[PDB]
Design a protein around this nucleic acid. Structure first.
Lengths: 61, 64, 64, 62
DNA sequence: TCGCGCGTCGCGCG
DNA sequence: CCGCGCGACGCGCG
């Protein structure tokens, strides 16, 4: 998918143990946050992304 | 100056030259409430160290 | 807006006294998206016009 | 709500065509101004209070 | 033209 | 124990 790959490549250009927030990616890609989270949690359903607790939640691998 | 000032200053510097960011962003990356960040941000602008461009939210960068 | 506020308040009136209904129910009866239904519900609660009871889903009744 | 009554009764005692400021209500009632305003704008939500422009804004009963 | 109310928001939910 | 309202907000204020 489109958002899926954008979000993946971005994370790789951040680091391995590095994680970011949805809101961050929302402004770093100019796409609505409700949308980022939708694709974030979706990528989780595929084992491509790992979510780590917090408010807001953090996203990596 | 204080701890918060130095912290925010080194942060903005390590972004480039004509780069900017928001209080919200700093609040998250410094693990500090946003009211405090804004307290220091506007204070630094009063010392000519920081420059603020309009917007909602406002953007912040090093003063030229 | 204050249109829905009436459609709902009126629907809640006929519901009797002390009888609470859900947002999902209203969504059907009023042919309105649950989201807009909830927006107005929580808004009215703030206006002290509506009272909300715990549960899943939450129940809604005329306040006081 | 506990505050809403206090503020209302005061604006009732004030007068119909009369308007006071949040900064004043804060002083009379001994309530931090933030709370006064917090309630003021809330009461304006419920159509109980009417706000008319100015710096500071003026407040009266609907 | 100090006006200020302002809290959190975590939300992924189909 | 799907609960979801969620956007307004720019706020720094002594």
């Amino acid at each position: 998918s489109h958002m899926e790959q954008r979000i993946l490549k971005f994370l790789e250009e951040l680091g391995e143990g590095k994680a970011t927030t949805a809101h961050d990616l929302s402004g770093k890609l100019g796409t609505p946050k409700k949308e980022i989270n939708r694709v974030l949690y979706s990528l989780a359903k595929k084992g491509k992304l790992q979510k780590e607790a917090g408010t807001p939640p953090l996203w990596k691998i």
